[PDB]
Structure 1
Amino acid sequence: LPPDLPDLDPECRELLLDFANSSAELTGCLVRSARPVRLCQTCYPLFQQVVSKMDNISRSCARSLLMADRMQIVVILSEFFNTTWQEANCANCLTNNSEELSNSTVYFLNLFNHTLTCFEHNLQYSEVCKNCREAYKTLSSLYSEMQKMNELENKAEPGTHLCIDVEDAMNITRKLWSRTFNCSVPCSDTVPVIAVSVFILFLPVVFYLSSFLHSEQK
């Protein structure tokens, strides 16, 4: 029988098996890094391996592996892995296989680890709020730097997200600071707001009544 239809080619079986264990490893690493999200900072080597192994297949086995069937496992699985990378925006915080993005990401994760070191020994949620308050603001200021940088260095679209483990690290500590520790203290200027608002809202009452009364008098 021809070594294409009923069975795999000798050089196509190994290529498919090589891509098989690479895709299995990436999928296992994706789940283990789902919570807390350490996706782009842990799965970046395995994702590159999968993409490279896709290229070797799609170079002498492309016909027998890529579009040989109605359902294309290798195409959809690699497309799914690509979509996961793009949606996670792991291109950010990864400058051509480099861990950082102009050292911004390692600095953020170093700051995030430093910031989270406060929230452990400052409990025994009172002493955390004022002791290293600037540590949270230092991290929070840096995060806003990347948002504007992401619209200048990258310039994809206003509102584009950064790489997910950076974005998740902000939310881990934002919810750990303004929600569990209640260290957020807005001033809540209320009585002057009420006095000013009722004064402005009372102006149309004067204007319409005075206009009506003045016309009636004359």
Structure 2
Amino acid sequence: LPPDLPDLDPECRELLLDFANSSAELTGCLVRSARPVRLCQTCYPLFQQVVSKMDNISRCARSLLMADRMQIVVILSEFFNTTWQEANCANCLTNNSEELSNSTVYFLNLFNHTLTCFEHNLNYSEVCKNCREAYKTLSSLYSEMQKMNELENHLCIDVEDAMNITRKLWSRTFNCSVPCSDTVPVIAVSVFILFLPVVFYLSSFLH
């Protein structure tokens, strides 16, 4: 036989079976950290090693990627990169994807504090009292990170899911609301301005 036509070169079968090992690991990592979204903080070394194992084959490149109309190693890496770009996991990682950044590890520690205060303060009025001060600094830090990453141009999915859980737990299912009676001064200035055109139209008609 000639090489590569019905089978694979032996220095090319090993570079497919390790990329098969790290891709199953990455898929399992994604689906296990799927719904409590711990995705960008659990699956970053598996993603980086999938990227490295593709870089170690694109540097039998002609015998794996460009050899069929369907490019399985290409389309699965491109799926991983679309998953990684759509999650914006680069926001959760610091500069060279070595560890979690200081902004995210500080944010995810207040999320734990706010949930422990939610648990300890269990009628949702003792919840709304004594814990409005932690929700306030949590929401302000979220706005700080959001404008901070706007100074570069969604955030990381790991922090958006945490803030989504916290807001969904605070606004509904706790119903912590602010009354803010301001209807009566708003009506009186509304009626006063809307009464100016009939005065202008009558006094110009009579005179």
| TM-score for the superposition, normalised by structure 2 | 0.94
- The alignment's C-alpha RMSD in Å is 1.7
| Within-5 A mapping of 1:41-56 | 41-56=41-56
Task: Tell me what 1:181 maps to.
Answer: 174
The verdict on how the C-alpha distance between 1:75 and 1:109 changes in structure 2, with shifts beyond 3 A counting, is same
Please tell me whether the aligned partners of residues 22 and 46 of structure 1 are also in contact (alpha carbons under 8 angstroms).
yes
Percent of residue pairs identical:
100
Superposed CA deviations along residues 65-110 of structure 1, whole A, max 9, x for unmatched, are 1111101111111111101111111010201455666411111111
The verdict on how the C-alpha distance between 1:89 and 1:182 changes in structure 2, with shifts beyond 3 A counting, is same
Please tell me whether the aligned partners of residues 91 and 156 of structure 2 are also in contact (alpha carbons under 8 angstroms).
yes
Measure how far apart 1:129 and its partner are. 0.6
Q: d(CA) in 2 for partners of 1:188 and 1:52?
A: 60
Question: What SS does the corresponding residue of 2:96 show, helix, strand or coil?
Answer: coil
Please tell me whether the aligned partners of residues 44 and 97 of structure 1 are also in contact (alpha carbons under 8 angstroms).
no
Please tell me whether the aligned partners of residues 88 and 157 of structure 2 are also in contact (alpha carbons under 8 angstroms).
yes
Measure how far apart 1:209 and its partner are. 2.3
Question: What SS does the corresponding residue of 2:147 show, helix, strand or coil?
Answer: helix
Return 5+ residue gaps in structure 2 as ranges.
none
Structure 1 runs of 4+ aligned residues shifted over 2 Å read 96-102
Measure how far apart 1:144 and its partner are. 0.8
Superposed CA deviations along residues 165-188 of structure 1, whole A, max 9, x for unmatched, are 111101110111111111131514
Please tell me whether the aligned partners of residues 44 and 97 of structure 2 are also in contact (alpha carbons under 8 angstroms).
no
Q: d(CA) in 2 for partners of 1:148 and 1:100?
A: 22
The verdict on how the C-alpha distance between 1:102 and 1:49 changes in structure 2, with shifts beyond 3 A counting, is closer
Question: What SS does the corresponding residue of 1:47 show, helix, strand or coil?
Answer: helix
The verdict on how the C-alpha distance between 1:124 and 1:97 changes in structure 2, with shifts beyond 3 A counting, is farther
Aligned pair count reads 207
Question: What SS does the corresponding residue of 1:8 show, helix, strand or coil?
Answer: coil
The verdict on how the C-alpha distance between 1:209 and 1:190 changes in structure 2, with shifts beyond 3 A counting, is same
Superposed CA deviations along residues 8-44 of structure 1, whole A, max 9, x for unmatched, are 2111111111111211111111111111111101111
Please tell me whether the aligned partners of residues 92 and 158 of structure 2 are also in contact (alpha carbons under 8 angstroms).
no
Task: Tell me what 1:168 maps to.
Answer: 161
- Which piece of structure 1 moves more, 69-78 or 188-197? 188-197
Question: What SS does the corresponding residue of 1:6 show, helix, strand or coil?
Answer: coil
Please tell me whether the aligned partners of residues 177 and 184 of structure 1 are also in contact (alpha carbons under 8 angstroms).
no
The verdict on how the C-alpha distance between 1:45 and 1:188 changes in structure 2, with shifts beyond 3 A counting, is farther
Please tell me whether the aligned partners of residues 89 and 156 of structure 2 are also in contact (alpha carbons under 8 angstroms).
yes
Q: d(CA) in 2 for partners of 1:8 and 1:142?
A: 54
